[PDB]
Design a protein around this ligand. Sequence first.
Ligand SMILES: CC[C@@H]1C(=O)N(C)c2cnc(Nc3ccc(C(=O)NC4CCN(C)CC4)cc3OC)nc2N1C1CCCC1
Length: 271
Amino acid sequence: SMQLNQYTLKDEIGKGSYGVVKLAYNENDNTYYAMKVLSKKKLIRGCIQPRGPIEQVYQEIAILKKLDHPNVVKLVEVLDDPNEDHLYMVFELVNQGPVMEVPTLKPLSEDQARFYFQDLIKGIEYLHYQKIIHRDIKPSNLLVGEDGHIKIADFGVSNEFKGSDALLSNTVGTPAFMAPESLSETRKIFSGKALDVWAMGVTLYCFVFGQCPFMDERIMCLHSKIKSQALEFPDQDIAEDLKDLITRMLDKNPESRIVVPEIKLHPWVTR
Ligand SMILES: CC[C@@H]1C(=O)N(C)c2cnc(Nc3ccc(C(=O)NC4CCN(C)CC4)cc3OC)nc2N1C1CCCC1
């Protein structure tokens, strides 16, 4: 292990382009946390020129500091010495980790999917209320806590807006979960809340089938399938109310796509 202020850093629980995540034991309160460790030098290294990479991280932090909800992760501390390369983001630990990796041969049951989907609705409703568009909803960003409920993580590409919805032009997120309106070659403008609904719909399909509705290892071909291919369900066999709900979330037109208030009232959700 190693010591970092009051924390004892232990097993590595994650890694990515961002850096790494360590299990961190706080010696003052005898509690485990998740510590994301980022290198400023490594971060330095709809196609708008975004703000710089360290600056994106501070935007993520600013968003996380506004959020306090049982189905959203909780940032507790940021350590950022101006004379050090590393930035540390300390979160409350979410015991059981990501709900699933996709693809998997082990999909969730319909009832287990409903349970988590209800948590996902509650978290997204809260985020939208707080004027945050998440932009990277997918199963691996939904963490299962000790109480068995999911929490929405990874606000790395999330947007904060003022007014009734965001007006977005940047094509960010995970390709398999991006909505068709975000994928035009033509520079255009799209609303944010519907992006999250689309991603929820892909997520729900993944929950019950273990594989995404649009799949291709070639990202260019994946984008084409999302824009042009009709949604199809395998033969293996889900309830018709579930197919209806997924179908409505995966409406390619964001003007007619189901909205969160309606999702809350859908038969599959309320049973
Ligand atoms: C801090 C970033 C983010 C967050 O926002 N919070 C709050 C968070 C809270 N708690 C966790 N917890 C755990 C996450 C992953 C694991 C785990 O078992 N990881 C494996 C280790 C071996 N490796 C080869 C494959 C992965 C265990 C966790 O808790 C015991 N993760 C969190 N994550 C991330 C979610 C994926 C990476 C970390």
